[PDB]
Design a protein around this ligand. Structure first.
Ligand code: SF4
Ligand code: SF4
Length: 55
């Protein structure tokens, strides 16, 4: 799964780009790890590179 790190500026760009809609809005956005397919689309549109493969 991917994880949205502290860089997140809560722009909202990644949510509509997630093919399985597993991103939730918050102070910083968060991924529902169990549904994430590691497609990387969120990482692709993020202006600050917050979404990265989980550690
Ligand atoms: S990697 Fe894909 S499936 Fe996982 S949160 Fe990002 S866009 Fe959604
Ligand atoms: S696109 Fe990037 S900065 Fe914007 S909400 Fe998603 S993770 Fe946060």
């Amino acid at each position: 799964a991917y994880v949205i790190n502290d860089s997140c500026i809560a722009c909202g760009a990644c949510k509509p780009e997630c093919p399985v809609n597993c991103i939730q809005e918050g102070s910083i956005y968060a991924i529902d790890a169990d549904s994430c397919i590691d497609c990387g689309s969120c990482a692709s549109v993020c202006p600050v590179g917050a979404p990265n493969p989980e550690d």
